[PDB]
Amino acid sequence: PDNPPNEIYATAQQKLQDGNWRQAITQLEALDNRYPFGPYSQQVQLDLIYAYYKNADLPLAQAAIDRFIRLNPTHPNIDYVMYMRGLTNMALDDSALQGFFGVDRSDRDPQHARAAFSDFSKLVRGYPNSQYTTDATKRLVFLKDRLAKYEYSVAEYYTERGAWVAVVNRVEGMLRDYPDTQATRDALPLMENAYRQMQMNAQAEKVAKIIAANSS
Amino acid sequence: KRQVSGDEAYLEAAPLAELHAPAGMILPVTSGDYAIPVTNGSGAVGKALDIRPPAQPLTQFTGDTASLLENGRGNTLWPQVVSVLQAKNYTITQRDDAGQTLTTDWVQWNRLDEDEQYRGRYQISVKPQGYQQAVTVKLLNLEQAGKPVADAASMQRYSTEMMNVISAGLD
Amino acid sequence: EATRNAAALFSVDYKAFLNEVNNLNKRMGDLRDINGEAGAWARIMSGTGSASGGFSDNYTHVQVGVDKKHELDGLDLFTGFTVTHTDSSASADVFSGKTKSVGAGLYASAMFDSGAYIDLIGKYVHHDNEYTATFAGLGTRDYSTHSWYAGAEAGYRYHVTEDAWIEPQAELVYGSVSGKQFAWKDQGMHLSMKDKDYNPLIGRTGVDVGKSFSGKDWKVTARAGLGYQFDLLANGETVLRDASGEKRIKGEKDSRMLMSVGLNAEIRDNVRFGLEFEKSAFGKYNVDNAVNANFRYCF
Amino acid sequence: VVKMSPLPTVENQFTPTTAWSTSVGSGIGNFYSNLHPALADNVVYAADRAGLVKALNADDGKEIWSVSLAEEPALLSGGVTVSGGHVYIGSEKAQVYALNTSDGTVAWQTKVAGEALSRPVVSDGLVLIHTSNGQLQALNEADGAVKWTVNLDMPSLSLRGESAPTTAFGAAVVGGDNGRVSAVLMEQGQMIWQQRISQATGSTEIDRLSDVDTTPVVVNGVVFALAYNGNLTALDLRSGQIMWKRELGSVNDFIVDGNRIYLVDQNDRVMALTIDGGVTLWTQSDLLHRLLTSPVLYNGNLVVGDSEGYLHWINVEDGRFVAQQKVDSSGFQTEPVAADGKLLIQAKDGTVYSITR
Amino acid sequence: EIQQINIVGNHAFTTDELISHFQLRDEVPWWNVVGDRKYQKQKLAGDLETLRSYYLDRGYARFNIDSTQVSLTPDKKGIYVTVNITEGDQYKLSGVEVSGNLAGHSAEIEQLTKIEPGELYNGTKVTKMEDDIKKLLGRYGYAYPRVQSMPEINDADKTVKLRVNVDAGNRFYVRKIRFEGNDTSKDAVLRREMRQMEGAWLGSDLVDQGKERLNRLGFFETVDTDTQRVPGSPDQVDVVYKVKERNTGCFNFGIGYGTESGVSFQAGVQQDNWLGTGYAVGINGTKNDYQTYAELSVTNPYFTVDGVSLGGRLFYNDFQADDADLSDYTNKSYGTDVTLGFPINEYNSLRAGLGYVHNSLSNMQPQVAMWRYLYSMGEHPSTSDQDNSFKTDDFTFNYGWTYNKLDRGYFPTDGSRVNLTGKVTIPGSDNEYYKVTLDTATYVPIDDDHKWVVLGRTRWGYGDGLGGKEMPFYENFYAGGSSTVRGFQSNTIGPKAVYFPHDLCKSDDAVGGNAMAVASLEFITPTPFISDKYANSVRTSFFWDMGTVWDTNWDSSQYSGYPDYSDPSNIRMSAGIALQWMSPLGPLVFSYAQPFKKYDGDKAEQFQFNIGKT
Amino acid sequence: RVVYRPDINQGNYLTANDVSKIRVGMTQQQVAYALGTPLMSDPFGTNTWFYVFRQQPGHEGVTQQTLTLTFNSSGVLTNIDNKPALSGN
Q: What was the elucidation method?
A: cryo-EM
Q: Write D280-288 long-range contacts (CB < 8 A, 24+).
A: D281/D318, D282/D318, D282/D319, D283/D319, D284/D314, D284/D319, D285/D6, D286/D6, D286/D8, D286/D9, D286/D321, D287/D6, D287/D8, D287/D312, D288/D4, D288/D5, D288/D6
Q: Is E210 on the interface with A (CB under 8 A)?
A: no
Domain containing residue C133: 2-294
Paired residues of C103 in beta bridges: C84, C125
Q: How would you class A157 by CB atoms within 10 Å of its CB: exposed for 0-12, middle for 13-18, buried for 19 or more?
A: buried
In a domain, C178, yes or no: yes
Q: What is the least distance, in Å, from the CA of E306 to any CA of chain F?
A: 6
Distances (CA, A) of C34 to C121, C273, E355: 19, 19, 54
Which of E245, E261, E287 terminates a domain? The answer is E245
Domain containing residue F19: 8-83
Which of E86, E114, E145 terminates a domain? The answer is E86
CA distance E190 to E194: 7
* E129, E140 contact by CB (below 8 A): no
In a domain, B39, yes or no: no
Question: b vs e for D198-230, b when ≥16 Cβ sit within 10 Å of the residue's Cβ?
Answer: bbeeeeeeeebbbbbbbbbebeeeebbbbbbbb
Q: Do residues E162 and E185 both lie within one domain?
A: no
Q: Which helix (H) or strand (E) holds F50?
A: strand F49-56
Q: Which helix (H) or strand (E) holds A188?
A: helix A182-197
Q: What is the least distance, in Å, from the CA of A197 to any CA of chain B?
A: 23
Kindly determine whether residue F45 and residue B28, on different chains, have CB atoms separated by under 8 Å: no
* D316, D299 contact by CB (below 8 A): no
Q: Which helix (H) or strand (E) holds A197?
A: helix A182-197
CA distance C55 to B44: 74
* D191, D184 contact by CB (below 8 A): yes
Q: Is B21 on the interface with F (CB under 8 A)?
A: no
CATH number, residue E30:
3.10.20.310
Q: Which residues contact A1 (CB under 8 A, 6 or more apart)?
A: none
Question: b vs e for D319-341, b when ≥16 Cβ sit within 10 Å of the residue's Cβ?
Answer: bbbbbbbebbeebbbbbbbeeee
CA distance A196 to F89: 13
Residue closest to C254 by CA, chosen among C60, C63, C94, C15: C15
In a domain, C299, yes or no: no
Q: Is B58 on the interface with F (CB under 8 A)?
A: no
Kindly determine whether residue F4 and residue E345, on different chains, have CB atoms separated by under 8 Å: yes
Q: What is the least distance, in Å, from the CA of E591 to any CA of chain F?
A: 42
Q: Which helix (H) or strand (E) holds C148?
A: strand C139-156
Residues 25-84 of B with CB under 8 A from A: 25, 27-34, 36-37, 39-46, 49, 51-56, 58, 61-62
Number of structural domains found in chain B: 1
Three-class secondary structure of residue E380 per DSSP: coil
Of the partner residues A128, A209, A213, the one whose CB lies closest to the CB of residue B39: A128
Resolution value (Å, 1 decimal): 4.4
* D82, D40 contact by CB (below 8 A): yes
CATH number, residue B156:
3.30.530.50
Paired residues of D121 in beta bridges: D128
Kindly determine whether residue D115 and residue E82, on different chains, have CB atoms separated by under 8 Å: yes
CA distance A147 to A141: 10
Tally the residues of chain B.
171
Q: Where are the alpha helices (DSSP H) in chain B?
A: 77-83, 153-169
Sheet strand arrangement including D342-345: D17-21, D353-356, D342-345, D337-339
Q: What is the least distance, in Å, from the CA of B11 to any CA of chain F?
A: 35
Q: Which helix (H) or strand (E) holds C174?
A: strand C169-177
Residues 200-219 of E with CB under 8 A from D: none
Per residue, the 3-state secondary structure of chain D, as one string, reads CCCCCCCCCCCCCCCCEEEEECCCCCCCCCCCCCCCCEEECCEEEEECCCCEEEEEECCCCEEEEEEECCCCCCCECCCCEEECCEEEEEECCCEEEEECHHHCCEEEEEECCCCCCCCCEEECCEEEEEECCCEEEEECCCCCCCCEEEECCCCCCCCCCCCCCEEECCEEEECCCCCEEEEEECCCCEEEEEEECCCCCCCCCCCCCCCECCCCCEECCEEEEEECCEEEEEEECCCCCEEEEECCCCCCCCCECCCEEEEECCCCCEEEEECCCCCCCCCCCCCCCCCCCCCEEECCEEEECCCCCEEEEEECCCCCCCCEEECCCCCCCCCCEEECCEEEECCCCCCCEEEEC
Kindly determine whether residue E182 and residue A108, on different chains, have CB atoms separated by under 8 Å: yes
End-to-end CA distance of chain A: 72
Distances (CA, A) of E547 to C34, E518, E544, E575, F74: 45, 4, 11, 12, 80
Distances (CA, A) of F61 to C2, E331, E525, F14, F89: 90, 57, 51, 19, 8
Q: Which residues contact E2 (CB under 8 A, 6 or more apart)?
A: E24, E25, E26, E37, E38, E39, E78, E79, E81
Kindly determine whether residue A200 and residue F66, on different chains, have CB atoms separated by under 8 Å: yes
Q: Do residues E131 and E181 both lie within one domain?
A: no
* E181, E242 contact by CB (below 8 A): yes
Q: What is the least distance, in Å, from the CA of A148 to any CA of chain F?
A: 20
Kindly determine whether residue F54 and residue A203, on different chains, have CB atoms separated by under 8 Å: no
Helix, strand and coil in chain E, % to nearest 5: 15, 40, 45
Q: What is the least distance, in Å, from the CA of E208 to any CA of chain A?
A: 20
Mutate to test the interface with A, among E174, E193, E197, E279 (most CBs of A within 10 A): E197
Residues 24-83 of A with CB under 8 A from E: none
Chains A and E in direct contact, meaning 3 or more beta-carbon pairs closer than 8 angstroms: yes
Mutate to test the interface with B, among A140, A185, A188 (most CBs of B within 10 A): A140
Mutate to test the interface with A, among F5, F9, F12, F40 (most CBs of A within 10 A): F40
Domain containing residue A177: 1-216
CATH number, residue C138:
2.40.128.130
Neighbours of B87 (CB within 10 A): 7
Number of structural domains found in chain C: 1
CA distance E428 to A23: 73
- Which residues of chain E lie closer than 8 angstroms to C278, CB-CB? 258
Paired residues of E318 in beta bridges: E332
Paired residues of C154 in beta bridges: C118, C170
End-to-end CA distance of chain F: 17
Number of structural domains found in chain E: 3
Q: What is the least distance, in Å, from the CA of A55 to any CA of chain B?
A: 10
CATH number, residue A156:
1.25.40.10
Of the partner residues A135, A142, A178, the one whose CB lies closest to the CB of residue B34: A178
In a domain, E181, yes or no: yes
In a domain, F3, yes or no: no
Mutate to test the interface with F, among E306, E310, E402 (most CBs of F within 10 A): E306
Q: Do residues E149 and E182 both lie within one domain?
A: no
CA distance E596 to E397: 40
Quote the distance between the C-alpha of residue E524 and its chain's center.
11
Distances (CA, A) of A107 to A148, C238, E398, E489: 10, 77, 37, 48
CA distance A81 to C37: 41
CATH number, residue F29:
3.30.1450.10
> What single string gives the DSSP state of each residue in E290-342?
S-EEEEEEEEETTSSTTS-EEEEEEEEEE----GGGSS--EEEEEEEEEEEEE
Mutual angle of helices A182-197 and A133-161, in 10-degree steps: 20
* C71, C111 contact by CB (below 8 A): no
In a domain, E287, yes or no: no
Distances (CA, A) of D339 to C275, D45, D261, F56: 91, 13, 19, 99
Number of structural domains found in chain F: 1
Sign for the CA dihedral angle at E125, E130, E131, E135 comes to positive
* E181, A109 contact by CB (below 8 A): yes
- Residue type at B52 in one-letter notation: R
Mutate to test the interface with F, among A203, A205, A214 (most CBs of F within 10 A): A203
- Which residues of chain D lie closer than 8 angstroms to E72, CB-CB? 157, 159-160, 209
* D44, D87 contact by CB (below 8 A): no
- Residue type at E174 in one-letter notation: V
* D336, D296 contact by CB (below 8 A): yes
Of the partner residues B6, B11, B61, the one whose CB lies closest to the CB of residue A94: B6
CA distance D23 to D346: 9
Distances (CA, A) of C21 to B45, C55, C133: 62, 20, 28
Quote the distance between the C-alpha of residue E111 and its chain's center.
35
* C146, C122 contact by CB (below 8 A): no
Neighbours of F18 (CB within 10 A): 16
Kindly determine whether residue A43 and residue B28, on different chains, have CB atoms separated by under 8 Å: no
Q: Which helix (H) or strand (E) holds A155?
A: helix A133-161
End-to-end CA distance of chain E: 46
* E105, E140 contact by CB (below 8 A): yes
CA distance E463 to E467: 14
Using the 8-state DSSP alphabet, how is residue F61 labeled? Answer: P
CA distance D37 to A146: 90
The full set of domain ranges for chain D reads 4-357
Q: What is the least distance, in Å, from the CA of C184 to any CA of chain E?
A: 25
- Which residues of chain B lie closer than 8 angstroms to A110, CB-CB? none
Number of structural domains found in chain A: 1
- Which residues of chain B lie closer than 8 angstroms to F43, CB-CB? 26, 28
